Design a protein around this ligand. Structure first.
Ligand SMILES: *[C@@H]1CCOC(=O)c2c(O)cc(O)cc2OCC[C@H](O)[C@H](O)C(=O)C1
Length: 342
């Protein structure tokens, strides 16, 4: 049984010659040689079975990814686990081996405008498919975007995904939220549970800004500070957009703030393509009802060299799926992974 950096990675004998890559949520990611297909692959170790929310995230991702099939979504090629529930302690997910992720790339590489445009196209193309299944990714960020050696992009990690539920999106002010802080839409902190598609478009807008400058556009340090960063750039919301926020605590918090001027996008990004900044503005719109939707974004002039709706496929059907004890959830993970046995 091979080990990498002092930890057991029990995937043989099909997968050998392991090398560290990085970290998933419940375990590390390695590369390995696939002795059957004769190519190196990526493998993620998942040890979820102690914690019920861990089991939730693992099951959710497996259920979605076994149904999804799209060029810009990384799939599941194989799942490795013990033959019996009694013996199963870890699960290993085998996926295509990519070359890097966008978080790592942006730490040292400046992107040409042609790279930015192609990455953004591919993000939106994958997102079109996800949203067409009535699913929200809910944690889009550079570390969840993988790139191969020719800059083809795939979206990773559906562990926070949910079915869209816009009729039950409303909540109170300062409602706690799980997804990554820097990519949270402003309404998360005001009145939203993040159950509508507009939550993902905001995150893509954050990713676009970060590709233009190699730095996060809104790097808040804590829950409410994230909103201060956003308002520091967008400026104060209009009366119309405030009137859309019926919750009094949220509205009165915004009314308590001094007026803030909008920072022009071309001041923040003086080298950027003007069409890219127009699309950026529409993705980083404060009012989620006015925010651009994924199919509109694909049709934006910035993406004209790539846009082709006949080559931007959608899901066959809407996706349908916690008080579930982890013992039922481990049982459910066991059953969901049976198709890859032996
Ligand atoms: C994605 C989990 C799968 O990640 C990978 O397959 C992966 C490959 O193939 C190559 C490289 O360079 C990195 C990879 O993932 C790193 C981890 C990733 O950023 C994220 O944390 C995930 O776990 C989601």
């Amino acid at each position: 049984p091979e080990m990498v950096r002092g930890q057991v990675f029990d995937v043989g004998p099909r997968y050998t010659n392991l090398s560290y890559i990085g970290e998933g949520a419940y375990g590390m990611v390695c590369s390995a040689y696939d002795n059957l297909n004769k190519v190196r692959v990526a493998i993620k170790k998942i040890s979820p079975f102690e914690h019920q929310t861990y089991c939730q995230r693992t099951l959710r991702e497996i259920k979605i990814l076994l149904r999804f099939r799209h060029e810009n979504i990384i799939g599941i090629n194989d799942i490795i686990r013990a033959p019996t529930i009694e013996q199963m302690k870890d699960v290993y997910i085998v996926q295509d081996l990519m070359e890097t992720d966008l978080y790592k790339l942006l730490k040292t590489q400046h992107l040409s405008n042609d790279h930015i445009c192609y990455f953004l196209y591919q993000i939106l193309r994958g997102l079109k498919y996800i949203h067409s299944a009535n699913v929200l990714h809910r944690d889009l960020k550079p570390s969840n975007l993988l790139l191969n050696t020719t800059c083809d992009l795939k979206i990773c990690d559906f562990g926070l995904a949910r079915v869209a539920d816009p009729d039950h999106d409303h909540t109170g002010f300062l409602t706690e939220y799980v997804a990554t802080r820097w990519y949270r839409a402003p309404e998360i902190m005001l009145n939203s549970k993040g159950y509508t598609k507009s939550i993902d478009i905001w995150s893509v807008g954050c990713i676009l800004a970060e590709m233009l400058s190699n730095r996060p556009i809104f790097p808040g340090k804590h829950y409410l500070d994230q909103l201060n960063h956003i308002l520091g750039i967008l400026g104060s919301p209009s009366q119309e957009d405030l009137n859309c926020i019926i919750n009094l605590k949220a509205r009165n918090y915004l009314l308590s703030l001094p007026h803030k001027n909008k920072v022009p996008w071309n001041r923040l990004f003086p080298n950027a393509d003007s069409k890219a900044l127009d699309l950026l503005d529409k993705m980083l719109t404060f009012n989620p009802h006015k925010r651009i939707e994924v199919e509109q974004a694909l049709a934006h002039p910035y993406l004209e060299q790539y846009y082709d709706p006949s080559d931007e496929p959608i899901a066959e059907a809407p996706f349908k799926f916690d008080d579930l004890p982890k013992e039922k959830l481990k049982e459910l993970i066991f059953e969901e992974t049976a198709r890859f046995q032996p």
